[PDB]
From a paper:
Dinucleases of the DEDD superfamily, such as [name], Rexo2 and nanoRNase C, catalyze the essential final step of RNA degradation, the conversion of di- to mononucleotides. The active sites of these enzymes are optimized for substrates that are two nucleotides long, and do not discriminate between RNA and DNA. The active sites invariably consist of (i) a catalytic DEDDh/y-containing core for divalent cation coordination and catalysis, (ii) a leucine residue that wedges between the two bases of the substrates and (iii) a 5′-phosphate cap that coordinates the 5′ phosphate of the dinucleotides.
To confirm that Actinomycetal [name] proteins function as dinucleases, we measured the in vitro and in vivo activities of [name] from Blastococcus (OrnBla) and Nocardioides (OrnNoc). Actinomycetal [name] proteins readily cleaved both the RNA and DNA dinucleotides in vitro. A comparison of their kinetic parameters with those of previously studied [name] homologs from Gammaproteobacteria V. cholerae and P. aeruginosa, OrnVc and OrnPa, respectively, revealed that OrnVc did not distinguish between RNA and DNA dinucleotides and that OrnPa, OrnBla, and OrnNoc had a slight bias toward diribonucleotides. Given that OrnBla and OrnNoc were able to rescue the small-colony phenotype of the P. aeruginosa Δ[name] strain to the same extent as OrnPa, our results suggest a conserved cellular role for [name] proteins as housekeeping dinucleases. The crystal structure of OrnBla in complex with [name] further confirmed a conserved mode of substrate coordination across the bacterial [name] family, including homologs from Gram-positive species. Structural superposition of OrnBla-[name] and OrnVc-[name] showed that the sugar-phosphate backbones of the substrates aligned perfectly. The residues of the active sites facing the substrate sugars are hydrophilic and can accommodate both deoxyribose and ribose. The only significant structural difference between OrnBla and OrnVc is the additional C-terminal helix of the former, which is far from the active site and has been previously reported to stabilize the dimeric assembly of [name] from M. smegmatis.
Numbering used by the authors:
A (entry chain A): 5 to 209
B (entry chain G): 0 to 208
The structure:
């Protein structure tokens, strides 16, 4: 409960049938978003044919970051990278199905991890904390907060990306969420009873 | 444009023969539309999708039991609706509120699981929805850590594993969080947001250097 696993993946594209996983960065925070270790950033080998298949937008970002040339030199396999990520996570989260996976639009990463790294996929809780869910809520409920987001960076790797995901959530914690510990038990029970009453007729049909 | 975000939210809950994206079948899809303030705009759509007798007999004991007890299995057996037909019905329904593709987030509890089945079986619907999603369970997990009394006060959900009631309870859960763990609208001023952004940028700058 006291730890969050953050992952950002890079791919040759978004297609779960055809595209390859070429980078996995992993970061651990506690439940208060304190970063517990500098993180891991693993560059996974893919063949030149797979890299030649990237579309213009993906080929361009991975060229500008230098990722593609690093992928070409790497000998790390998906199975080797999975064992490295699993051991790293277990230093802080030894028990399986206890820590959620966290990131921006993190379900996309999870799909590639479920396909390529089943042992890691099963070690993480199925629940995830999608920072972009909060982003899109703020976009509608608190538009000035949405437009005030910290600017995210250019031409950097997956590890910098996942750190900026934590920073974005730390920004929302200071702006759109109430102060901890939050409402009292009586206040929470009252709010729950209000929305139960407000949704009762719709639920009854 | 894809920079535009729709003021309406699309909510979907699915039932399946199991969680395996290779082997399991989509057998129920419920769809609900809300405005940004979580007002439900229509009673919702609930589609029972046919699945072969083999797929139903191959359900594991946990899933076979839940879909028997809810009546879903008998409904699936009686249904003649295909996934392609259900997909076109879902699209026509959503487009009454969200006509532009890639503008409305998909919303639910652990909605990435539903999205994987939609991407596999309903590619046109998958493309019409924004890739971004509002996972109410992400807020639930934040409440567990930052607001535990709100976490323990969540309204009790039904255990029926039926798609329309369950997606309505997902909206109700987010409405609960809106009143408990989110600040009052309109929220921070521009100046307050700038200060908070500067604080976290300063806080993470060395790590990102
Ligand atoms: Na990402
Ligand atoms: Na990235
Ligand atoms: Na569900």
């Amino acid at each position: 409960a006291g730890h969050l696993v953050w992952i950002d993946c890079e791919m040759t594209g978004l297609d779960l049938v055809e595209d390859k996983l070429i980078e996995v960065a992993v970061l651990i925070t506690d439940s208060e978003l304190n970063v517990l270790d500098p993180g891991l950033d693993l560059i996974i080998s893919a063949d030149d044919a797979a890299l030649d298949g990237m579309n213009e937008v993906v080929r361009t970002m991975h060229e500008k970051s230098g990722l593609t040339e690093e992928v070409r030199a790497s000998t790390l396999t998906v199975a080797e990278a999975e064992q490295q990520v699993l051991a790293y996570i277990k230093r802080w989260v030894p028990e399986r199905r206890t820590a959620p996976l966290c990131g921006n639009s993190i379900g996309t990463d999870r799909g590639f991890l479920a396909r390529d790294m089943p042992e890691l996929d099963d070690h993480l809780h199925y629940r995830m904390i999608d920072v972009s869910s909060v982003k899109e809520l703020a976009r509608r409920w608190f538009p000035r907060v949405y437009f005030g987001q910290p600017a995210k960076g250019l031409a950097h790797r997956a590890l910098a990306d996942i750190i900026e995901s934590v920073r974005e959530l730390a920004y929302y914690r200071r702006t759109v969420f109430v102060d901890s510990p939050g409402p009292s038990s009586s206040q929470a029970k009252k709010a729950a009873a209000e929305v139960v009453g407000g949704f009762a007729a719709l639920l009854d049909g």
